[PDB]
Amino acid sequence: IQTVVKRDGRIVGFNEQKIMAAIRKAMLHTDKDTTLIEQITDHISYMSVEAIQDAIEMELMKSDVAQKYIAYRNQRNIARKAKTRDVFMSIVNAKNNDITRENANMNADTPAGMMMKFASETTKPFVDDYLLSEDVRDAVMHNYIHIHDKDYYPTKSLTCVQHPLDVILNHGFRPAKRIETAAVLACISLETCQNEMHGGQAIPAFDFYLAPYVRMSYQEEVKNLEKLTGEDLSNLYDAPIDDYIEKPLDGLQGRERLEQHAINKTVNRVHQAMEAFIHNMNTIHSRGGNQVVFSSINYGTDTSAEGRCIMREILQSTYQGVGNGETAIFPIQIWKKKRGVNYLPEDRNYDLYKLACKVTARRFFPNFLNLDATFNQNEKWRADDPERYKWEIATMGCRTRVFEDRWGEKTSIARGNLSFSTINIVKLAIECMGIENEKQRIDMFFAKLDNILDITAKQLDERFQFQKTAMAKQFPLLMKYLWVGAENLKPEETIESVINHGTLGIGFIGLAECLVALIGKHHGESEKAQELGLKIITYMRDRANEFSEQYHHNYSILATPAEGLSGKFTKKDRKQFGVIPGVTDRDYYTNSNHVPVYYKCTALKKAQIEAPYHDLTRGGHIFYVEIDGDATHNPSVIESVVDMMDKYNMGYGSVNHNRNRCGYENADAHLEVCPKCGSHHIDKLQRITGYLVGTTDRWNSGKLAELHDRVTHIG
Amino acid sequence: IQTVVKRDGRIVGFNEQKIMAAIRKAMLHTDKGEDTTLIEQITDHISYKSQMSVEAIQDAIEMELMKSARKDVAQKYIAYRNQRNIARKAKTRDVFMSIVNAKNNDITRENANMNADTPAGMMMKFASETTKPFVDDYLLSEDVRDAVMHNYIHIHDKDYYPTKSLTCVQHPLDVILNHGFPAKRIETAAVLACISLETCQNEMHGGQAIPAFDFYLAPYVRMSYQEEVKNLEKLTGEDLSNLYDAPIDDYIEKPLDGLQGRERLEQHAINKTVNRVHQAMEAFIHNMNTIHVVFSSINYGTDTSAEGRCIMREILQSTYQGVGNGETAIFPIQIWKKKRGVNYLPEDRNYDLYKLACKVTARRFFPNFLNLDATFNQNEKWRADDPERYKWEIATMGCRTRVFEDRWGEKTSIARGNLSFSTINIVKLAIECMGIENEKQRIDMFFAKLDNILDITAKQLDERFQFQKTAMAKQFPLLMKYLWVGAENLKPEETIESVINHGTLGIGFIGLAECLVALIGKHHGESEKAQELGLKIITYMRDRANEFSEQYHHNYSILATPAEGLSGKFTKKDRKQFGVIPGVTDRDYYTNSNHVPVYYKCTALKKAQIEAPYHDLTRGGHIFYVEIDGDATHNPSVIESVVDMMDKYNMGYGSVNHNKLQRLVGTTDRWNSGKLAELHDRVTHI
Numbered sequence A: 001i002q003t004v005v006k007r008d009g010r011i012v013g014f015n016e017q018k019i020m021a022a023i024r025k026a027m028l029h030t031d032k033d034t035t036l037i038e039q040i041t042d043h044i045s046y047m048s049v050e051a052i053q054d055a056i057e058m059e060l061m062k063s064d065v066a067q068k069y070i071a072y073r074n075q076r077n078i079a080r081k082a083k084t085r086d087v088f089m090s091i092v093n094a095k096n097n098d099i100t101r102e103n104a105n106m107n108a109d110t111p112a113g114m115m116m117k118f119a120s121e122t123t124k125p126f127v128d129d130y131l132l133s134e135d136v137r138d139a140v141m142h143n144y145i146h147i148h149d150k151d152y153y154p155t156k157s158l159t160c161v162q163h164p165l166d167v168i169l170n171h172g173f174r175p176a177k178r179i180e181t182a183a184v185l186a187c188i189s190l191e192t193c194q195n196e197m198h199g200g201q202a203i204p205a206f207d208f209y210l211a212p213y214v215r216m217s218y219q220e221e222v223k224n225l226e227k228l229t230g231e232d233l234s235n236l237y238d239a240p241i242d243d244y245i246e247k248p249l250d251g252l253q254g255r256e257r258l259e260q261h262a263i264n265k266t267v268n269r270v271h272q273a274m275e276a277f278i279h280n281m282n283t284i285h286s287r288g289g290n291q292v293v294f295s296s297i298n299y300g301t302d303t304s305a306e307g308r309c310i311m312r313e314i315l316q317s318t319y320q321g322v323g324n325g326e327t328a329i330f331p332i333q334i335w336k337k338k339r340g341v342n343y344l345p346e347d348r349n350y351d352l353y354k355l356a357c358k359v360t361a362r363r364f365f366p367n368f369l370n371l372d373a374t375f376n377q378n379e380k381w382r383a384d385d386p387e388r389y390k391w392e393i394a395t396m397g398c399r400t401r402v403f404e405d406r407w408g409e410k411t412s413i414a415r416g417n418l419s420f421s422t423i424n425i426v427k428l429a430i431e432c433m434g435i436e437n438e439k440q441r442i443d444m445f446f447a448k449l450d451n452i453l454d455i456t457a458k459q460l461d462e463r464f465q466f467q468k469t470a471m472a473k474q475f476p477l478l479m480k481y482l483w484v485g486a487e488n489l490k491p492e493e494t495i496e497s498v499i500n501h502g503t504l505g506i507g508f509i510g511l512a513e514c515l516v517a518l519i520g521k522h523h524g525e526s527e528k529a530q531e532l533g534l535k536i537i538t539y540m541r542d543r544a545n546e547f548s549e550q551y552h553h554n555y556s557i558l559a560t561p562a563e564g565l566s567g568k569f570t571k572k573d574r575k576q577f578g579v580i581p582g583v584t585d586r587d588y589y590t591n592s593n594h595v596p597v598y599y600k601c602t603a604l605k606k607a608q609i610e611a612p613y614h615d616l617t618r619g620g621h622i623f624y625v626e627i628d629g630d631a632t633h634n635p636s637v638i639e640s641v642v643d644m645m646d647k648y649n650m651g652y653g654s655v656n657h658n659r660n661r662c663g664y665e666n667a668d669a670h671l672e673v674c675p676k677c678g679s680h681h682i683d684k685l686q687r688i689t690g691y692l693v694g695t696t697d698r699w700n701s702g703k704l705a706e707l708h709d710r711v712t713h714i715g
Numbered sequence B: 001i002q003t004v005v006k007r008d009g010r011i012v013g014f015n016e017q018k019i020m021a022a023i024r025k026a027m028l029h030t031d032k033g034e035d036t037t038l039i040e041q042i043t044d045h046i047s048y049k050s051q052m053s054v055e056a057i058q059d060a061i062e063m064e065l066m067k068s069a070r071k072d073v074a075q076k077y078i079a080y081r082n083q084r085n086i087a088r089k090a091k092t093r094d095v096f097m098s099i100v101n102a103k104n105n106d107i108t109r110e111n112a113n114m115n116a117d118t119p120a121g122m123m124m125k126f127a128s129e130t131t132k133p134f135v136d137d138y139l140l141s142e143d144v145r146d147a148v149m150h151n152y153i154h155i156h157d158k159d160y161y162p163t164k165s166l167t168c169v170q171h172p173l174d175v176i177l178n179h180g181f182p183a184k185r186i187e188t189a190a191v192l193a194c195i196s197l198e199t200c201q202n203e204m205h206g207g208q209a210i211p212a213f214d215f216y217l218a219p220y221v222r223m224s225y226q227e228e229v230k231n232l233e234k235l236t237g238e239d240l241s242n243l244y245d246a247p248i249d250d251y252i253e254k255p256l257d258g259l260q261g262r263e264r265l266e267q268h269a270i271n272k273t274v275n276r277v278h279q280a281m282e283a284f285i286h287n288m289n290t291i292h293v294v295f296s297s298i299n300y301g302t303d304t305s306a307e308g309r310c311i312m313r314e315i316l317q318s319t320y321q322g323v324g325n326g327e328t329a330i331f332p333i334q335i336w337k338k339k340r341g342v343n344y345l346p347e348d349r350n351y352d353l354y355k356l357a358c359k360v361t362a363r364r365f366f367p368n369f370l371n372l373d374a375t376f377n378q379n380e381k382w383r384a385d386d387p388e389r390y391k392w393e394i395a396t397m398g399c400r401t402r403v404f405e406d407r408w409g410e411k412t413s414i415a416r417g418n419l420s421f422s423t424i425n426i427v428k429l430a431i432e433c434m435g436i437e438n439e440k441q442r443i444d445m446f447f448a449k450l451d452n453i454l455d456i457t458a459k460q461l462d463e464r465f466q467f468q469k470t471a472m473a474k475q476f477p478l479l480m481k482y483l484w485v486g487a488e489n490l491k492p493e494e495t496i497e498s499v500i501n502h503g504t505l506g507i508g509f510i511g512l513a514e515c516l517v518a519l520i521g522k523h524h525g526e527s528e529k530a531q532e533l534g535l536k537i538i539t540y541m542r543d544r545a546n547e548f549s550e551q552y553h554h555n556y557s558i559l560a561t562p563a564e565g566l567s568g569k570f571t572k573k574d575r576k577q578f579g580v581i582p583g584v585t586d587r588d589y590y591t592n593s594n595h596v597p598v599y600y601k602c603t604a605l606k607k608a609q610i611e612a613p614y615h616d617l618t619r620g621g622h623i624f625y626v627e628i629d630g631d632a633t634h635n636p637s638v639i640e641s642v643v644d645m646m647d648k649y650n651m652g653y654g655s656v657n658h659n660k661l662q663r664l665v666g667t668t669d670r671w672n673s674g675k676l677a678e679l680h681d682r683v684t685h686i
């Protein structure tokens, strides 16, 4: 009799005095009594509010009021969601708004790209309101903690993994027997697991995996040559080859001519296969919202002829380019350095190294990874045991490092990352800028940071608990072959007992402003700021270790590469607290543990100031170095940076320059008219946080100002 | 000063005492009975010309409360709005829960080629769920909304409505190869074909088709042969210059026994070229069936040169052997064009390839048959002498689509496609007129209802076309730069109004069999009045389509809609509304367009005779289906008989199937609920 729940969830009484008020309101002006209203009230008096409305309609119809009743309800039910309509119209019309450029690699104009924005915008509120806890929600609402790749939470999707590419090639999913077959199987495997993850893929040992097939190609070539001209060349199968070099046939005869011909035709096929592989991972737009698969490759630690044959071919292909002398945006290539193998002039591969340098002085790649840097070393590494690639460090895309373990064996193959979240420190500092006692200021800062860290750890543990319940069959390829503990679980079982072999990351942003917006100067010009910065980082590392010991997981600190986050906190902070000089007068925040870009400094000082942090940030780091356009010709400068890196303890590097873009990619400082193409279109090619990004139109609206303020360390 | 905008849209004014009550309610729980001391000043400060809004007041009061070092008051003042907005929603929470839990619900299974147990599938499902309600308002019209609500008109691809996307196109794979977006070897062309298909898939939401495989891939075998002979000459010093423009009857490989001098140096090159082509085709077929897989089709069969014959032989052999350890391939779609005098008679030149195709279509059923010159596929400008050209011969696209006729252009099927097609239900219109005992009145009422609904559907299609007209050039990068007919001289920031007019619009029909099983008489099988009634209905629909085309200045074509997922949709609503009817709404699915029900046993000749006259009227699409028993595998004579029967009558398409994989999809686990019963109720036409 009395059960009325007005929409929402409130439980209220049946007043019975407004059901007449509303009907009277609907008849104020419709041309067309009190008795009829009383009869309707009596009839209805004989529940869910919404439903009953329909009955009311008929009571009005059987008597100019029904049309005046549903119309108003629909006209008010539509104005309640006039905020989503604006964003939907913005997406449909494909305008350059802040909500369509959060990722500079996608293309939102195409229907495929346009179909991802709706899913992201519809799935963010769901995870916000129905999955997270209350403390985490309140922390996130106030712009303190950030969750990365939030709009994948319900899918239970991991981030990155290193591919073991020996089971796939050997057993297939038929076995390969030529160079091209393996070269295509690699691409197939890479694109069939960037559909079960939201991060990137890396291949740690290119040479050690693709070497044993050049021998098979040579054997097939010799067999064909013997078939043509009847002879017995059986002995010339296991012939020790020092190098797979090519020479013109300018005068020779007998079996030597046949052997030289076989070598030449085995080299050409490898060159073709490598070129095809490069061209395959740069145009097949097949990864999701109209993207290219995020792929990286490792090499530089092999001595056999085949390995040194593959490296030379891939480097030559990269130098040559794709198209009319253009530059390939993918894959990411990183060179591995180790004294006694590559660096010293007496070592076996020092001639391929003095080249990586020449290529990197032209095409932005490869980068350099410093092995045995006092934390990348290992104890089970024998130089005479097939140059073990298992006991070596490999780096995934966007400054990610996974090398340490606590309940297994120290390796980097068949393991990856599960999630990582970021903590804002600028707001904590600015919240305590009204005190004069420095000791109390620092103590309050530390207390607040301690408070935030526990919430972050709880959030990571909650996400891990949610991911633990995923089924095996949701990841067919990534849970049968490519993982450190697969091959012993059915497709109708959980992955609870094979998931703990992973890493969790805690990051930070703006250490060049947070701890130094409270003091006179930053860590690039004041000697005393370095001590405070190192104290903060050490405190964070100690708390991370304590959390690892507590929750039974693997926590690590990381320098978050900010792409869409470079201008997200700044706007809200400026709106709330206003404008403070040298803190929030830039529209962007300097990346983690990095000197401000707009501060002029030489390479030596920058390296010395950014060196000690790399030991603490044991989840990822980087050391950028700009170079002017006229010093991009000499491949001598990329050798300073590397020896400077080696002198101190650093584990990652790169070099960047400006590049204007028929496709005449001239590197001069400024260009007016292209030499060949008369079109005025002249774009710029550079990197944002670890990958090159097209032209200066598909960028974020907040990180573009950073590109206009970079300074050119000359070397 | 007394005006505040509100969520509901009413503006009016504020008494300003409501805020005090709200704060009191907030504070009456935290065990902190604050008096009006703070409330007086907070109200005075927050009160200070219609400039305020309900959202702004919320933020202002929250900040002021936080500044009082209370927080908890704010904590449960903001924890009440959120628990209310949740109750104002979550009526669509069960669907999301089912999707997340990965259960076998009807929502998950709509397309059998998509995987719902992967992040990409879940993302697409969320996008579809959040975009379907949007189109129902702010885009359609009131009359169209009423029509669609009452289960009359079905709009295909309604998820992609706001994206302004077309459906399908025929690839002119010659400009792409000659001028790269230039191949010099067979492998490069094989890779570029797949790259083009994959990149063009995203810009549309339908299948892709290659209209002439041989005429495009032939000119590269000769270059491969030239390279091989040049390499062999480099090996052993000889001239070998003359042996470049040497005609070859056919590339056949034989053992190198008892050969010497300049005769062993040509058979070897031929063998190498054959192996190269075989490997390239095997790579193509293996790559287009395991790359996450673009519904693709390829057409071939009307070439007479040596290179085309080699390509066809190699691809047929690769298909016969199979991909993997003897597992039948699923994609791509292979169709064999039949021409009388070039590919059919024993005296013709491609008879052996025809027999090989008939032998492959018994164990690896997939090579279909397209009958050219079937009284409507003839073209007046097709002659085989100079190039034996291909731009004036029909080319299918799979999914029963057929785009061949235009009224403001050339009669071709290259670089043209279908824009959108809707479906009209004709079973409910008959179930609602099953009470009148006077037959003539029943027929007249049915025709009137059909006229009205058809006019509504035409208006809806025109509105969708008008919406799509405004799309811009940069919407589709590759499609509108090298592919779509006249679209080669338009700026990246210009409309596509000039080129879009060459597409086609399709009006589909479904359930012609059940429409008269008991509605207006007897079954479409053992009866003679059913044929006349069906012919009258289809002719009326065709005339209406023609007058619509003359009126709105567009292209309209009748269509036999494929069962995308519309096999258990209408039947459920009909069963719920009108209840159970013997022999009408008891099979939980409707037989496809102008077909004979599968559960009705009959021979091939009967089906051919019954379904022959309908094809001439369905100029937008049609299909012929035959089933056979296991034995069929080891006897290609049955396929020859079926094809001869098709040629004797007037038809334009065909296929054969043997009754786990079955017509293509994998194991019978990703099917829709409705089609499983249909599969379980299939018979065999020996």
Ligand SMILES: Nc1ncnc2c1ncn2[C@@H]1O[C@H](COP(=O)(O)OP(=O)(O)OP(=O)(O)O)[C@@H](O)[C@H]1O
Residues within 6 Å of the ligand: A004, A005, A006, A007, A008, A012, A013, A014, A015, A016, A018, A019, A022, A049, A050, A053, A073
């Ligand atoms: N407290 C109530 N007790 C009984 N009937 C009510 C009550 N409030 C509203 N009704 C009846 O229910 C109808 C629902 O109208 P209304 O749209 O206001 O619903 P609601 O759920 O209260 O939401 P809202 O006020 O936000 O629109 C009112 O027109 C009136 O007929």
Ligand SMILES: Nc1ncnc2c1ncn2[C@@H]1O[C@H](COP(=O)(O)OP(=O)(O)OP(=O)(O)O)[C@@H](O)[C@H]1O
Residues within 6 Å of the ligand: A006, A018, A022, A025, A026, A068, A069, A070, A072, A073
């Ligand atoms: N001026 C009006 N003209 C037409 N219909 C009206 C009018 N005012 C209210 N209604 C009808 O009354 C209902 C809306 O009621 P209203 O928005 O006044 O909330 P309410 O029921 O009084 O709220 P609550 O119970 O939450 O206090 C809908 O049925 C709407 O059609």
Ligand SMILES: Nc1ncnc2c1ncn2[C@@H]1O[C@H](COP(=O)(O)OP(=O)(O)OP(=O)(O)O)[C@@H](O)[C@H]1O
Residues within 6 Å of the ligand: B004, B006, B007, B008, B013, B014, B015, B016, B018, B019, B022, B054, B055, B057, B058, B081
């Ligand atoms: N009529 C009013 N005029 C001015 N301020 C108001 C009025 N009603 C409420 N407020 C205050 O402004 C806030 C507006 O937020 P709120 O979401 O409650 O608005 P609303 O439109 O009244 O909500 P709902 O329709 O969901 O009941 C209220 O929390 C209260 O603090």
Ligand SMILES: Nc1ncnc2c1ncn2[C@@H]1O[C@H](COP(=O)(O)OP(=O)(O)OP(=O)(O)O)[C@@H](O)[C@H]1O
Residues within 6 Å of the ligand: B018, B022, B025, B026, B076, B077, B078, B080, B081
């Ligand atoms: N029990 C409660 N505890 C805490 N806050 C509450 C409680 N009930 C309501 N509020 C707060 O009061 C406001 C909700 O008010 P409500 O929607 O009932 O209408 P109102 O503010 O009186 O205005 P209107 O005249 O539009 O109905 C929100 O600020 C909500 O946070």
Ligand SMILES: Nc1ccn([C@@H]2O[C@H](COP(=O)(O)OP(=O)(O)OP(=O)(O)O)[C@@H](O)[C@H]2O)c(=O)n1
Residues within 6 Å of the ligand: A102, A103, A104, A105, A148, A149, A198, A199, A200, A291, A294, A397, A398, A560, A561, A562, A563, A564, A565
């Ligand atoms: N095409 C891309 C781009 C980057 N990454 C991943 O996306 C993250 C982006 O870094 P970050 O800026 O910290 O996160 P967001 O701000 O959310 O980046 P975005 O908005 O572009 O997603 C990186 O860790 C990288 O692994 C990726 O998998 N796919």
Ligand SMILES: [Zn+2]
Residues within 6 Å of the ligand: A662, A663, A664, A674, A675, A676, A677, A678
């Ligand atoms: Zn140019």
